[PDB]
Design brief:
Chain lengths: ~140, ~140
């Protein structure tokens, strides 16, 4: 009920997820959020099981839902998979960049809801779509 | 006529840029592209000079232009600044993630033009955003 939203950052490669999270954490002075890197030799199912296992452990601290921030590929499917398996409300967002991790952790750490965080992140993506749109014009 | 577009990945953190670049290079079997990890202690001007310094030592290898893939605000001015200073055509994409680096590196390595790469990445980025937030 007063749990902060749980933020998990999952990305392809050796240290993208963890390095992006470290950046946000150092900018905000917080240690909340969890990063997991999927190196190229690791099967997608193996990664899901890493995430699911930690989620299951911390179930009682994840009363206000989970936000999965991913880059690409199969990883977004984990959001619905976790909800189906654990019943914990999950939103998943692809194409995650440093700013998005930063904004997710900042809002999570001050107790904003999963829905409020998801909406603000959508607005950030929309701002960028528009900035890019305007740049393509010239 | 033959230069590949030079792709530069500039990200905040210990290994964000280099990790994304390595993922792309390994997935694609190519060694092209430059990553520059910017630590939080580094000044904006130092970051800029790091980029500019490499660029101007390899001008002819960049004569088909430069694509900067960046994350955060301060880096977002570097494209126009680099172009103004060097005259080498530069495009820049913010909110860079793994798939942005992947497709930029894939296109550059097969000899796609700057305008084409930039166009296609922006179109893909918008498509995925719209599908993500659809329902």
């Amino acid at each position: 009920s007063n749990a902060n939203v749980g933020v998990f950052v999952l990305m392809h490669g050796d240290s993208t997820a963890s390095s992006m999270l470290k950046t946000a954490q150092e900018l905000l002075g917080t240690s909340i959020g969890t990063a997991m890197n999927m190196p190229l030799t690791m099967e997608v199912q193996t990664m899901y099981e890493q995430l699911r296992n930690q989620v299951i452990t911390q179930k009682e601290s994840l009363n206000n839902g989970i936000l999965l921030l991913t880059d690409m590929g199969s990883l977004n499917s984990f959001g619905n998979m976790l909800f189906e398996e654990t019943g914990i409300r999950t939103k998943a967002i692809t194409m995650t960049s440093t700013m998005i991790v930063l904004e997710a952790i900042r809002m999570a750490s001050v107790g904003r809801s999963l829905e409020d965080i998801y909406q603000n992140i959508q607005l950030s993506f929309e701002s960028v779509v528009r900035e890019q749109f305007r740049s393509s014009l010239q």
